[PDB]
Design a protein around this motif. Structure first.
Motif, mmCIF file in Angstrom:
data_model
loop_
_atom_site.group_PDB
_atom_site.id
_atom_site.type_symbol
_atom_site.label_atom_id
_atom_site.label_comp_id
_atom_site.label_asym_id
_atom_site.label_seq_id
_atom_site.Cartn_x
_atom_site.Cartn_y
_atom_site.Cartn_z
ATOM 1 N N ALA A 1 0.791 -1.244 0.000
ATOM 2 C CA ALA A 1 0.000 0.000 0.000
ATOM 3 C C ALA A 1 0.825 1.298 0.000
ATOM 4 O O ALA A 1 0.358 2.319 -0.508
ATOM 5 C CB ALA A 1 -0.970 0.006 1.175
ATOM 6 N N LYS A 2 2.032 1.258 0.569
ATOM 7 C CA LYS A 2 2.933 2.429 0.591
ATOM 8 C C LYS A 2 3.785 2.627 -0.682
ATOM 9 O O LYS A 2 4.565 3.579 -0.750
ATOM 10 C CB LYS A 2 3.834 2.398 1.839
ATOM 11 C CG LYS A 2 4.945 1.355 1.830
ATOM 12 C CD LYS A 2 5.540 1.171 3.217
ATOM 13 C CE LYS A 2 6.566 0.050 3.234
ATOM 14 N NZ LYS A 2 7.187 -0.130 4.574
ATOM 15 N N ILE A 3 3.637 1.744 -1.673
ATOM 16 C CA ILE A 3 4.316 1.884 -2.969
ATOM 17 C C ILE A 3 3.637 2.964 -3.814
ATOM 18 O O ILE A 3 2.513 2.771 -4.274
ATOM 19 C CB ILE A 3 4.315 0.550 -3.757
ATOM 20 C CG1 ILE A 3 5.149 -0.503 -3.017
ATOM 21 C CG2 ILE A 3 4.852 0.742 -5.175
ATOM 22 C CD1 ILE A 3 5.028 -1.904 -3.579
ATOM 23 N N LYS A 4 4.328 4.084 -4.029
ATOM 24 C CA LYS A 4 3.831 5.169 -4.889
ATOM 25 C C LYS A 4 4.377 5.114 -6.330
ATOM 26 O O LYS A 4 4.014 5.954 -7.155
ATOM 27 C CB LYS A 4 4.134 6.531 -4.252
ATOM 28 C CG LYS A 4 3.570 6.685 -2.844
ATOM 29 C CD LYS A 4 3.800 8.075 -2.250
ATOM 30 C CE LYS A 4 2.524 8.898 -2.101
ATOM 31 N NZ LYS A 4 2.239 9.772 -3.269
ATOM 32 N N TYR A 5 5.231 4.130 -6.625
ATOM 33 C CA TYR A 5 5.777 3.923 -7.981
ATOM 34 C C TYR A 5 4.932 2.938 -8.795
ATOM 35 O O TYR A 5 4.049 2.270 -8.253
ATOM 36 C CB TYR A 5 7.257 3.484 -7.939
ATOM 37 C CG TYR A 5 7.597 2.280 -7.072
ATOM 38 C CD1 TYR A 5 7.352 0.978 -7.512
ATOM 39 C CD2 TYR A 5 8.200 2.444 -5.821
ATOM 40 C CE1 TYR A 5 7.676 -0.120 -6.724
ATOM 41 C CE2 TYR A 5 8.525 1.352 -5.027
ATOM 42 C CZ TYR A 5 8.261 0.072 -5.482
ATOM 43 O OH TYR A 5 8.581 -1.015 -4.700
ATOM 44 N N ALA A 6 5.210 2.864 -10.098
ATOM 45 C CA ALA A 6 4.425 2.053 -11.035
ATOM 46 C C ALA A 6 4.652 0.554 -10.852
ATOM 47 O O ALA A 6 5.785 0.118 -10.649
ATOM 48 C CB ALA A 6 4.751 2.447 -12.468
ATOM 49 N N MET A 7 3.565 -0.219 -10.935
ATOM 50 C CA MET A 7 3.604 -1.686 -10.867
ATOM 51 C C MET A 7 3.200 -2.275 -12.223
ATOM 52 O O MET A 7 2.018 -2.520 -12.478
ATOM 53 C CB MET A 7 2.670 -2.195 -9.760
ATOM 54 C CG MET A 7 3.032 -1.713 -8.361
ATOM 55 S SD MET A 7 1.997 -2.434 -7.067
ATOM 56 C CE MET A 7 2.786 -4.022 -6.827
ATOM 57 N N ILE A 8 4.192 -2.501 -13.084
ATOM 58 C CA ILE A 8 3.954 -2.944 -14.464
ATOM 59 C C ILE A 8 3.532 -4.414 -14.503
ATOM 60 O O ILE A 8 4.159 -5.263 -13.865
ATOM 61 C CB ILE A 8 5.204 -2.743 -15.363
ATOM 62 C CG1 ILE A 8 5.568 -1.253 -15.442
ATOM 63 C CG2 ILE A 8 4.962 -3.317 -16.762
ATOM 64 C CD1 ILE A 8 6.790 -0.930 -16.278
ATOM 65 N N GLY A 9 2.473 -4.697 -15.263
ATOM 66 C CA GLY A 9 2.021 -6.062 -15.521
ATOM 67 C C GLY A 9 2.569 -6.558 -16.846
ATOM 68 O O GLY A 9 2.487 -5.848 -17.852
ATOM 69 N N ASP A 10 3.120 -7.775 -16.843
ATOM 70 C CA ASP A 10 3.769 -8.359 -18.023
ATOM 71 C C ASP A 10 3.304 -9.809 -18.251
ATOM 72 O O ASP A 10 4.109 -10.744 -18.189
ATOM 73 C CB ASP A 10 5.300 -8.277 -17.860
ATOM 74 C CG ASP A 10 6.063 -8.653 -19.134
ATOM 75 O OD1 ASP A 10 5.520 -8.497 -20.250
ATOM 76 O OD2 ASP A 10 7.223 -9.106 -19.013
ATOM 77 N N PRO A 11 1.999 -10.004 -18.533
ATOM 78 C CA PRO A 11 1.474 -11.359 -18.770
ATOM 79 C C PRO A 11 2.042 -12.046 -20.024
ATOM 80 O O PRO A 11 2.217 -13.267 -20.021
ATOM 81 C CB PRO A 11 -0.041 -11.139 -18.889
ATOM 82 C CG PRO A 11 -0.197 -9.717 -19.287
ATOM 83 C CD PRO A 11 0.947 -8.978 -18.660
ATOM 84 N N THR A 12 2.322 -11.267 -21.071
ATOM 85 C CA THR A 12 2.982 -11.775 -22.283
ATOM 86 C C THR A 12 4.436 -12.196 -22.044
ATOM 87 O O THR A 12 4.962 -13.045 -22.764
ATOM 88 C CB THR A 12 2.976 -10.725 -23.415
ATOM 89 O OG1 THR A 12 3.497 -9.482 -22.927
ATOM 90 C CG2 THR A 12 1.571 -10.510 -23.941
ATOM 91 N N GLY A 13 5.081 -11.582 -21.053
ATOM 92 C CA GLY A 13 6.472 -11.870 -20.725
ATOM 93 C C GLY A 13 7.478 -11.236 -21.673
ATOM 94 O O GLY A 13 8.641 -11.634 -21.686
ATOM 95 N N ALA A 14 7.042 -10.243 -22.451
ATOM 96 C CA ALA A 14 7.895 -9.593 -23.451
ATOM 97 C C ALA A 14 8.936 -8.688 -22.798
ATOM 98 O O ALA A 14 10.101 -8.701 -23.191
ATOM 99 C CB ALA A 14 7.049 -8.797 -24.435
ATOM 100 N N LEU A 15 8.503 -7.906 -21.808
ATOM 101 C CA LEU A 15 9.403 -7.024 -21.048
ATOM 102 C C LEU A 15 10.415 -7.857 -20.252
ATOM 103 O O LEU A 15 11.592 -7.501 -20.175
ATOM 104 C CB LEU A 15 8.612 -6.098 -20.102
ATOM 105 C CG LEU A 15 9.123 -4.667 -19.879
ATOM 106 C CD1 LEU A 15 8.349 -4.010 -18.744
ATOM 107 C CD2 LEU A 15 10.616 -4.603 -19.593
#
Lengths: 166, 164, 166, 167, 163, 165, 166, 163, 162, 167
Positions: free
Chosen positions: I90-104
């Motif tokens: 809850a204290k994370i103010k940075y971006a949480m990127i989702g990578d279901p394809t696994g490309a990143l």
């Protein structure tokens, strides 16, 4: 190759519809809802019951702006003969496409290669040509036409109202 | 390339013969004279006259020890219906081979690929399975059954009596 | 994979026709009915009877606007000798095409590969170059020229009257 | 070409089922009716109504002798969280198979390649492992659980009665 | 890839010899000197002078233990007819091999592809099947049979006498 | 796939001719009758009776307009030494082409790959560069130069009298 | 590939040695020091000076237990003739290997491809077949035979005294 | 095949020459006589005597108009350290090229692959880039610098004076 | 082949950041320092302590001009749920990127193929897109955020002082 | 593809260690903790500080049962000279591997191809040969030895204690 959410490929087949023969292409499906109803063969025992049930709901389907296309690997000449012969087929006012080449069947990934007959599959296609629902069954298992309507009604709702609240 | 003087390939098809379904294979053609009579499709205008002309000479063919196999890309279910419906087809006492896969048709190099139907062709095959005569014609042109009998009798003569 | 209803491939062969040598090509067959009469070899027993029967009906064929082309793997020099020596061959007024390369014989899928000779096959070709009738027979069996005339007169009737049958 | 009337391929996936993690394979589906119920993702809007409808008929499905396998590209850890948080998912008593590799999803030709999620597809598999009925729909369109029961009851009838066929 | 000092390839052709047809293969040539005499076609103007010249020296060739094989792309049926019609061909007592397939000709790399006929070529072969001499000419230049005897006599000398 | 009635391939070889070295190419053969007389090696005991017989008829060959080219895998430096040493080679006025690379030999398909030496072959080439006669022989068997004149005289006749022999 | 400190490849060549022909192979070099003295061609101006030097030092080489092999693309028949004519070649008591195929020259990676002659190169080989020294020079430049002996004596020292160096 | 009488390939390496680092390429060798003196590695026993010899004759080499290039698979940083430590290396005024990639070494076909070092080879190159002399030896056998001069003087003679 | 001192590849992934969903691409990282913080999965035991440790130093990082991107094979929907349920997330103010394809994840050579999850790996990237530091650890071993700052401060120093 | 949790490849290199040359292979690393400490070149400015920091903690590393292997594309001859010249290198008692071929460096995917030098990378390897921690850095950035110990102490804990995990 999952065909869901993909555009239908072009085709050019001969069909039977209300006594006369006609040519049907992908141009005829543009701007209108379509139902490509595949089945194995004419003069069989299970197929008339499925096709007859769709014929009972055809007035309802035409009201929703939906064409139906019965497809099989028999010729368009055979479909005319079966229409006269069988009682449950005689009430079909929609088109019955003949596909002796199997081209239309192979576009929809629905041929039994060892038999040379199309599997029992139903494809609901939107005005843009995109496949919105698929329903494939085994030789014995029949397809209900009342569930097909529920899927078309649902497909039409989401098209008209994209991203509904819950 | 040419199928003349070559052995017929193996096959397995369903067929309609005298109000009953049967499976026909290359084993059933061994040791006997055979006629594979290809045609485009059921419920057409030209086919009944051809198939009917062979049906009239079937008495004569059976006497010569010759089996007849009508072939097309329609199903064996369709052949039963066409036999009941049409009158010229109702007199056919020989087998009507269904070939939806087109395997039998493609074995004899007799498929219209863009149409998905067999061409009008007659193949005379001897007891050893070797193709002794081939006839092929266009859509409009009919095949004479008396000319077929002339070739079968010629093929039977040269088999029993080589070199004259 | 059938040569029926397909256009003939181009060729360039030397031939013998009425005491002189000539070059014949696909250009010569254009705009006319043609009969390519294949046979195994010169100086054999069955071939003169077939070629002699077609020679008897050549007046009728030329009446109907039909050119006959006798083809074998033997050379055009051999056809001149066989025409002089044999009596049933001497009456042939149509062209005897030599095909030592086998190019013409292979264009019609009619070569005995292990023997290096043409099979006994007749091809009826229309003005557009499309093959309208094929007739192949074994070594022992003979070809009837009266049947050939029936198929040409049939083919000419369907061309002249489109949307009709025999 | 077509996965109808073909045997299912082998797999090895972790899954959440009634408050404990378990491993599931093709060996577990042998000699039994199985429903592989694919869907895009957890914590979405349309997915819980679809799964909740099957959960209402799970009393009936178990009686017929039918396994239900809910499948997505999310992890089995995520399925446990979604089970606790959502009310409609809490009533589910069948296995929620995680498929982060996408191997199970790709075995059934049911992956959105550019998206990385499974399509809305149901597969009815018989005791021998043969796929007897397929049902795919687009993102918006929902699947009916009563129609699934019709197809299973039909499939069971055709298997048990050779020669006979359902219209 | 020269054919001199290389073994001949197998073949199976039909041939005309002394009023009857026979099959000839590579097995017949083994243990004996052979001459594969190629030429373009039957019923031509200049081929009878080449073959007839070899027919005059065939008495001498049979004494030396040498078989002559006249080869062309015509059939063995054609060779029978050309034997009866022409006087210069009628005196040929050696085999006239027909090669309608072109297999024997293509073994010796002697086929005109665009013409479908063999080139004017003479190949001398020893008992082991090895080609000891080759002579090829264009379609107006004849082949002297006296020169062929000189090469065969030279080939027989060096084969017997080592070094 | 023979090379009778085919155009000769281009080449660049050193040669020896009458006490001086020269370079010979396909351009030098253009428009004239040429004889490429191949042989295995120099300082051998299959005496230059082949080369000597052609040397005896070179006065007749030069009358007809025929250039003789004696080709071998040995160098042009060697041909000069063999010319001075041997009596039968000393009377050769025609060119002796050296072919240490084996390019000229491989163009005529005449190389003994295991030995690295040329076969005993005589190629008659016409003004257009087309090969009109071939005569290949085994190690022991000689080649008659009186027979070679018959082939060239016959070749010249059919060239100058088209459509007949 | 660097050929130094690598085993020599097998070969089969004819050679001239003291008025008789012989067959030299890789077997013959085994258990002995060997020198492969490559040069372009016979009857040239620079090579008799090079080969004449090694002929003068051959007394010393045979004492050390070293064979010499004079290699070129000319035949073994030419090496016989060049031995009789030239004075500087006549004093060669070592083998002169002919290499018309170029196989031996190509094994030592020493062929002028466009010329078809060997380059002026000297290879020193030990009893095990390993190349211990290589010396290559251009067409104009000559090789010193006194330098070659100093390389051989250095090579024989390190072989008999492992660890120590020159 | 042989590198004698062939043009040197391109390169781009860093080198040590009289305290400071420099880059050396093909353009530096153009229009000048050049010697690529390869050796296995720095801080070995045999190498300093070989490099010490050419260092003594470098006065004569620069007089003739020749550039020396000492090459090895060690870095240019290492050559600087070896120059300070060893007395026999300290007198080297010529450029010591570092070749860690082995690109220059492989261009002259002088890499011992299993060890990853350069063989003891000397390549004399003329103003046009053509390799006029090669001299390779095994690990134990040392190279003589007085021989190298005799080859360079021979190479300069034939270049300036033909015939 | 090593990814140190190489340019990052293009990507197009959805992310969760301060309530709302957003799209992040390689264009968004240009002209600024970036941190790609990979981890196996959401709703696990070890990951909250690592991500919470970086969340504590995000005040200091934002001063230094670094954008933190927490990446995993889970969806952007799952990151929102995990953010609400857990206190350390809850204290994370940075971006949480989702990578279901696994490309990143596959661009950075950081995929467990048999598991279908990202390895515990941290990547420090500069304004030009070049990877200046890599730290990878096993499943059990945690990463220290105090070390990550030292690497960033070192990387920022040597960029400005060549 | 990643090298984390993968077995190290075989090798055969010559190394300098306490005034003598020794051959080191993959066999020597078996059944023991190993640290492959890659760096670019000898006689450089920033490298001594890194290697000296590990040399200070080498007494502690040997105590824990951990071997250190300082690798670079220079020869084993060069390492001896650098050990004598520099005072910060003189206190190194661990093995200094010489890799002039670049076989060992390429096994760990750590070669600068255009430069022909190794990248600054530390690889912690367990007794079974499996890589438990990787730490690559740019040319300017230094590697802390105190962090390396923290990773090794964490790696040793999880190996000996199945079930438990570090923070």
């Amino acid at each position: 190759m999952s065909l869901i959410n993909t555009k239908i490929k072009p085709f050019k087949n001969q069909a039977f519809k209300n006594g006369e023969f006609i040519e049907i292409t992908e141009k005829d499906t543009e701007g209108r809802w379509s139902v490509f109803f595949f089945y194995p063969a004419d003069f069989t025992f299970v197929c008339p019951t499925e096709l007859g049930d769709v014929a009972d709901h055809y007035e309802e389907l035409q009201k929703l702006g939906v064409d139906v296309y019965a497809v099989s690997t028999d010729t368009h000449f055979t479909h005319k003969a079966w229409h006269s012969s069988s009682e449950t087929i005689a009430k079909i006012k929609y088109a019955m496409i003949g596909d002796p080449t199997g081209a239309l069947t192979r576009n929809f990934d629905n041929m039994r290669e060892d038999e040379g007959l199309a599997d029992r599959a139903t494809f609901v296609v939107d005005p843009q040509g995109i496949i919105q629902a698929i329903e494939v069954t085994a030789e014995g298992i029949g397809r209900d036409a009342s569930d097909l309507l529920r899927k078309i009604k649902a497909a039409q709702y989401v098209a008209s109202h994209p991203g509904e609240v819950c």
